[PDB]
């Protein structure tokens, strides 16, 4: 389904936005299909949020599966703020082209002339505001433009209507540069080859003023206008709905970057060499919460998605399982299993293997990974953790971690309980004491 | 790449588990690849958990894409339960088998006088810890593990240790019906045959006692009993890890199934028609974690996978696009405009285009969608909104949505703000009052 002409080595990611090095990366991860989707989903041509998500599959090669719950929020993310910072250069662009077709009187009057050609027997005034009137970026949303289309329609019976047979399949082809822009009813294929130029220029960012039939000559005069009107008022109203989408991506992208400090942080857990990397992160999108309503936000975007491609490639080339989930949900058994432990119980009972535990062979004395009283803890599995010695023991990058846990439901509203987990360092600390064959106590005890 | 005996009509999804008509769902909206990796993932050959999620790919055919993100979330969990109720049966079945090589008197003293023979050299009786009194469901975790082999390998020198040709790799089909198992340096490729229908015995679950070369020969005999204590020990110590990854299954899907109770919220903020769907699951999930610590969850997971089931197929059907991550960053933004709004701007004038809004024409004005003053309200797009007009003014389900935003750091300590969201209903209505051409006012006073 991919057209050839959205190939790009650097996956369509702009200079400005993603690096060389990192754009190599996703190339490196993805399998071939869902690469050239990649490419497709953060390509040139405009699209609904939603489209871009049904065309976006991440699948990485095998080798990378491990780490497919961090690089798919990752990856969509990038495209995400790729597609908003393109987006917006784009759509400038096409306002200053679009707006360059009548900003001189001489071309209004044309233009006002077209209008009482068209509508000589229109029953009001209506096309002035409707139509004249909103040929500019703010002119057309969604329920302007189908009143303006039908007002156009209206015009058939002041000529004669002989549309081209199958004008319907032929006009298909003026999405092939752009999935935002909605086909209007036009009735001549001389019309729409004009239209497939202008909309391809539209979405490269041609420097060439935008071709309307009705300029280009005197031939069928009214036939030539009714198509360029219907030109006219799709191509604004898909420009208004680009402004729209960019919005939706905007909003979007704030709430994925907040969301994926928690990510971080538990990526965190499984490899604390990350800790600075992670802290750093949290600076960055301290400082992008910290701005103004009203004011840009790239700058911030580019960084914190920069960071979030070092973690990623650490990530992966530590090549540990992970699974952030999985991780989130045995630290909430942790916390459970630490509220319920007995007082002849401490954490060093609870998270680490007797030291003779070998020695023991009673069937009746479940050793610690399979007995309900104690913790299995993960984060010593070297599938799920790994630290360098300099880094053993320093403490963990933290924030708050909770759940909610739905316990009720009154009516339409659900009831839950939050559970804050205020122990989390200490099956870290656990894993090092493991790792290292130490006591908490030893682990803990490098202050430092 | 997929062993041709994993390859199933309903995914490997055991009947008590998952109806037929959800598993032929699944099919339904899988790209082939896709499926084959459920089947894989689910099927009865045992795994670590890790190894699950690196072949579990779940990919939608195109025409099923616009609700991915909900179908991935739930049919992970389902590939959970699932390998959590057979797993369970399974090593169940696995101890029974092993545990009846040695049950009677008579083959006990068979044992210990094979131990005898070969360890006729040892120099200490280390055997018995380590190997004799280990040979149960809790005998050998894998540090235990690693030295009861070390300790069966030092026994070459006391019998005429010469390998059988190509062996090391000839035991690599050791692990075709099992992926937790792992491979000793058996030298027998008579031991190995043996071996193989053993395993292969165990994971499909055949009444049929395993077989031992020391007590089916007369021939060769320390060498037979050599690679016999290799398979006792390493058996053993996958069904022991066979209990650990349940274990880890259980505590996974009790966090994924609280978590997916604020995607299925979000899921009925776009198609409330699934309140009562919705606040069903939520009376199951209280439930769930009403019941006391540990008793088995199972029948509750059943009966959540099949209400979850329930949404995925009526979102799938209602062909709009679900994005839970989308939804939510839009609630979050309306919540800050409605923060921003002064009294002069009640929700009706935030929420919705004004009447007479398709008048206005000034560039200076921009309307509703775009104006930073106002909400663009996602649900009023056909493509994230749907509803019933028997629903139109029930109340949805709703239960506390919050986020943590990152403000600072000191040391290692990320601070948040916690973003408590009120009045999140007010969209919804407002999608309501934008579908029916109704005020915000006209659709409120309709509640109960």
């Known amino acids: 389904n991919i057209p050839t002409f959205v190939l790009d080595e650097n996956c369509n990611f702009i200079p400005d936005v993603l690096s060389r090095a990192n754009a190599k990366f996703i190339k490196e991860v993805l399998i071939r299909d869902s690469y050239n989707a990649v490419c497709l989903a953060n390509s040139f041509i405009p699209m609904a949020t939603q489209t871009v998500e ?13 780490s497919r719950d961090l690089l798919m929020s990752v990856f969509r993310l990038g495209v995400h703020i790729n597609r908003f910072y393109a987006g917006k250069n784009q759509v400038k662009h096409m306002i200053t082209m679009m707006k360059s077709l009548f900003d001189t009187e001489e071309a209004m009057r044309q233009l006002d002339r077209a209008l009482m050609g068209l509508f000589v027997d229109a029953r009001d005034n ?9 040929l500019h970026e703010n002119g057309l949303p969604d329920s302007k433009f189908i009143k303006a289309v039908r007002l156009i329609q209206t015009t058939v019976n002041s000529f004669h209507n002989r549309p081209d047979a199958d004008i319907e399949q032929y006009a298909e082809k003026l999405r092939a540069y752009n999935y935002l822009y909605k086909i209007p009813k036009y009735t001549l294929k001389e019309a729409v080859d004009i239209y497939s130029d202008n909309l391809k220029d539209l979405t490269i960012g041609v420097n060439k003023k935008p071709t309307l039939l009705f300029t280009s000559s005197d031939d069928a005069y009214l036939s030539h206008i009714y198509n360029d009107l219907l030109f006219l008022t799709s191509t604004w109203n898909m420009i208004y709905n680009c402004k729209k989408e960019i919005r939706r991506l905007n909003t ?24 600075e990397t992670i802290l750093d992160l949290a600076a960055l999108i301290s400082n992008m919460n910290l701005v103004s309503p009203d004011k840009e936000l790239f700058p911030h975007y580019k960084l914190i998605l920069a960071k979030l491609f070092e973690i990623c490639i650490f990530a992966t080339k530590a090549n540990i399982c992970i699974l952030p989930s999985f991780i989130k949900g045995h630290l909430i058994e942790f916390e459970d299993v630490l509220k319920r432990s007995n007082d002849d119980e401490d954490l060093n009972y609870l998270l680490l293997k007797s030291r003779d535990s070998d020695d023991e062979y009673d069937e009746d004395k479940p050793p610690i990974q399979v007995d309900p009283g104690r913790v299995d803890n993960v984060l010593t599995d070297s599938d799920f953790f790994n630290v360098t010695p300099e880094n053993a023991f320093s403490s963990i990058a933290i924030m708050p971690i909770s759940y909610d846990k739905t316990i009720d439901v009154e009516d339409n509203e659900i009831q839950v309980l939050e559970v804050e987990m205020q122990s989390l360092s200490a099956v870290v600390y656990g894993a090092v004491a493991s790792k290292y064959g130490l006591s908490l106590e030893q682990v803990i005890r490098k202050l430092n």
């Open 126 to 134: 209506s096309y002035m505001p409707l139509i004249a009137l909103s």
């Open 252 to 275: 979007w992208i704030k709430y994925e970057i907040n969301s994926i400090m928690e990510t971080a942080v538990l990526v965190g857990f499984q490899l604390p060499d990350l800790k």
């Open 54 to 66: 049904q065309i976006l599959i991440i699948i990485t090669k095998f080798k990378f599966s491990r």
